[PDB]
């Protein structure tokens, strides 16, 4: 056990001597200050003293007649995010705080002796985090009651590995793509395959993309899009299980596909090509992007997170009728999508060649920015739920953060010692949890880009992790054949 | 150099080259050593053999590197032609890999020579020499694919045309099967196939003819199809690059007849869109 060099006699003498105090009640300095919304709104000039931050925050409330708390920052070289006011004209800025705060996950929990196989995938349910499902090498998928940390009915029916599993955004039907050729449907309480499995696929399923609720009309169930090594994406009707059309534009395996809020299915493929297929176009490609040196390994969008919740916000209150649920999904999608006034769902594509590309599929095919600061392939790239921050995981043992819109580099984490696998985003964007080839789980504080806490315990090869929608609990899984839960 | 670098020594594949080097080392060096010989003499013999093998490998690699046309900065037209023909990036990467292998061989030979001068028993020196040879073979072993690709491109590069764009030239271009190949054959004392299909002269054949007591060279190319500047083949890319880089006007041909069954509107639109080349 290495020891940090102990403080010398000089350090002891310095520590023994008292120093300044933080009461700061007297002689508050006054300097001119300006207010300007972080995104677009430029403005409320004042020259106040070194007053408490709460007073400054409440000052802007009456200006806009909102009563809502707003996150505050200034000088956006300085990069400054009484203590802040004593550093020196400071140009202050504001943005919504999203008062709902997800408490940091620090405490571990006992393991569950469920399916005896390496874990492959896992995802939290949108309606409530109390239920969770994990995929593993075993052909059978199992749901878990997070409250009691116990398994649920076993999804018997598959004869090969369940590559991908995830709840539908409405939570009505779970999809569990099988390795061999098929995807099966399981409602939360069926305990058995719901009808005949979706078959007729030449190769294994790579990823699944549910139809967003905000686009789903009342009554009709959401469509289920699938991707596979065959290089084609089939659109499946959850009710009739029939395929309306299949697109084979991709000449190689489709790495992943995301059902955008505008009805466009942004997908990447091993052919180093990105094709924006759209359901509304009767299964036709509207535009094609080709800028990656290597193939595309992952895809993500700013509004993708809002799709997976299916109007089930952090409160977890289930809607009454499909129409009001769709309306609440649409309003939330507009809120997240219309961050910069207009609805613009930014897209980012992960390139294995130590590079990532920022894309705006709704506009010209010229890339917005070429995010390129990694040393190894970026395994996973995901937009922040807020949308202003972008993070990526790579095999180079580091996690890099980038600006959501301008592409400017922000910071890089180096806590992980081995290859970093997929990561998860907190419901409030305040904390990011990442898992790596190393047998450790870590969470990073976005507020200052510092290591918050370490969560070891897994035997080895923690392949994937997810964050609950409400943020109460965080699940994990790895090759140890043991599911472990984490909570504040 | 320029103008038909065919003089490259057409290196044999990796296995053949390694076998040749080993045979040369065995033949050009003494073989019969005995334990009773003085340790100094045995060590000197082993060091001499190792140094000879290393020097042979280094000389081979250096000759291979030098013989190549030095694509970098050679010429924009020649650079683009080579990039189209052999995918410049791959060729540069293969040459860099060869240079790295040569450097590794040099380092291994130096390290083994430094270590070899301390072994006491004859068996120790023999084992050190065997390890050095195995290291050299392993370094050479991974070079099979780049060496084969370089041999293929050399077989193709040697027969490539040789013309200087800076000189006075006039070229012939147009739609394929317009009779352009026949026009090239007739205008200059050159032999080219005149078969009636749209890819008769796949390669950029060079023709030479004299007028006004001055030599005037010419080139050939099948031309360009619709080709909206997104989907172009290597042959058509070579023609586009040649037209862009080359000197004074290239003759644009048009088959105003039933043959070349593209509407004359398409022929007009082709040159209208290619206008920036003018």
């Amino acid at each position: 056990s290495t020891l940090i060099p102990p403080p010398s006699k000089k350090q002891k003498k310095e520590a023994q001597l008292p120093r300044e105090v933080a009461i700061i009640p007297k002689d508050l300095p006054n300097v001119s200050i300006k207010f300007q919304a972080l995104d677009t709104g430029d403005n409320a000039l004042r020259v106040p003293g070194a007053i408490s931050e709460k007073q400054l925050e409440e000052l802007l409330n009456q200006l806009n007649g909102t009563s809502v708390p707003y996150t505050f920052s200034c000088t956006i070289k300085a990069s400054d995010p009484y203590s802040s006011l004593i550093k020196p004209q400071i140009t202050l800025l504001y943005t919504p705080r999203a008062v709902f705060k997800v408490k940091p996950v620090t405490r571990s929990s006992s393991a569950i002796a469920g399916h005896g196989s390496t874990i492959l995938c896992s995802a939290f349910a949108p309606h409530t985090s109390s239920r969770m499902v994990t995929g593993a090498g075993d052909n059978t998928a199992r749901i878990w009651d997070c409250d009691t940390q116990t398994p649920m009915h076993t999804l018997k029916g598959h004869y090969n590995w369940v590559l991908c599993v995830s709840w539908s955004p409405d939570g009505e039907v779970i999809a569990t793509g099988s390795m061999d050729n098929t995807i099966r449907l399981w409602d939360p309480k069926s305990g058995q395959c719901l009808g005949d499995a979706l078959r007729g696929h030449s190769k294994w399923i790579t990823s699944l993309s549910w139809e967003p609720i905000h686009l789903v009309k009342p009554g009709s169930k959401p469509r289920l899009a699938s991707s596979s090594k065959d290089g084609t994406i089939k659109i499946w009707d959850t009710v009739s299980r029939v395929c309306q059309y299949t697109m084979s534009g991709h000449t190689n395996s489709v790495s992943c596909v995301k059902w955008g809020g505008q009805g466009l299915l942004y997908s990447g493929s091993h052919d180093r090509t990105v094709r924006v297929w759209d359901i509304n176009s009767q299964g036709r490609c509207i535009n094609i992007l080709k800028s990656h040196a290597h193939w595309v390994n992952h895809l993500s969008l700013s509004t993708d997170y809002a799709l997976r919740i299916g109007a089930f916000d952090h409160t977890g209150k289930k809607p009454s009728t499909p129409e009001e649920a769709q309306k609440k999904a649409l309003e939330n999608y507009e809120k997240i999508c219309k961050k910069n006034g207009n609805s613009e769902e930014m897209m980012v594509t992960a390139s294995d060649d130590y590079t990532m590309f920022l894309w705006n599929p709704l506009k010209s095919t010229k890339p917005i920015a070429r995010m390129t600061g990694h040393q190894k392939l970026v395994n996973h790239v995901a937009f922040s739920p807020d949308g202003r921050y972008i993070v990526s995981a790579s095999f180079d043992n580091s996690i890099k953060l980038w600006d959501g819109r301008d592409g400017k580099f922000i910071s890089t984490f180096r806590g992980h010692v081995a290859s970093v696998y997929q990561v998860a985003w907190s419901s409030d964007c305040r904390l990011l949890v990442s898992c790596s080839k190393d047998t450790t789980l870590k969470v990073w504080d976005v507020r200052t880009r510092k290591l918050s806490v370490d969560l070891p315990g897994h035997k080895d090869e923690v392949y994937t992790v997810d964050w609950s929608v409400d943020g109460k609990r965080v699940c994990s899984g790895g090759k140890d054949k043991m599911v472990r839960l984490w909570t504040h | 150099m320029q103008l038909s670098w065919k003089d490259i020594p057409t290196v044999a594949p990796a296995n053949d080259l390694l076998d040749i080097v080993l045979n040369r080392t065995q033949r050009k060096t003494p073989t019969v050593i005995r334990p009773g010989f003085k340790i100094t003499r045995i060590r000197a013999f082993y060091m001499r053999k190792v140094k000879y093998t290393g020097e042979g490998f280094v000389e081979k690699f250096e000759d291979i590197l030098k013989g190549f046309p030095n694509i970098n900065d050679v010429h924009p037209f020649h650079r683009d032609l080579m990039d189209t023909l052999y995918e410049k990036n791959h060729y540069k990467i293969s040459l860099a890999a060869i240079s790295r292998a040569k450097s590794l061989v040099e380092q291994v030979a130096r390290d083994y020579v430094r270590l070899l001068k301390f072994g006491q028993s004859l068996f120790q020196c023999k084992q050190l020499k065997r390890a050095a040879l195995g290291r050299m073979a392993t370094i050479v072993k991974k070079l099979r694919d780049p060496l084969a690709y370089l041999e293929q491109v050399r077989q193709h590069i040697g027969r490539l045309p040789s013309i200087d764009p800076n000189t006075r030239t006039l070229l012939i271009c147009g739609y394929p099967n317009v009779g352009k190949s026949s026009f090239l054959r007739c205008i200059t004392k050159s032999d080219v196939d005149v078969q009636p299909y749209a890819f008769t002269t796949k390669s950029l054949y060079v023709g030479h003819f004299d007028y006004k007591y001055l030599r005037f060279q010419a080139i050939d190319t099948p031309g360009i199809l619709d080709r909206p500047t997104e989907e172009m083949n290597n042959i058509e890319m070579q023609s586009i690059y040649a037209i862009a880089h080359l000197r004074s006007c290239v003759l644009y041909f048009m088959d105003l007849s039933e043959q070349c069954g593209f509407t004359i509107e398409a022929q007009v639109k082709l040159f209208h869109s290619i206008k920036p080349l003018f």
Binding site: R272, A293, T355, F409 | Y86, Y149, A244, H245, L277
Partner: protein, 121 residues
Amino acid sequence: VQPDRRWFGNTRVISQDALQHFRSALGETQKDTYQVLLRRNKLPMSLLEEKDADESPKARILDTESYADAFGPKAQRKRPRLAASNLEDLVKATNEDITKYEEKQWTSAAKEAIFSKGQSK
């Protein structure tokens, strides 16, 4: 060698918290000529090193296309990749490349043997 709870046992484990302090010290450490080192501490410099020097070297193009497919009888490169999207920009690129190229555009007694240094082992 005797079996025991010895080697196959952990002996060099570093502390997780100390890594951040070591990284900060390495980033902030500075020295002058008047300051000299006597004992360089043994620490995992590999983890501390490799700071945010974002350069992202060139892609591994060979992985997408092998040497054999690039050229040869089994060619799989009928069309160039990343070629110019338009003729005008290609013409401009060729023009400026040509201009740059134009911008770039028996022997005396050999060396004396006295220069045997700093050769001469």
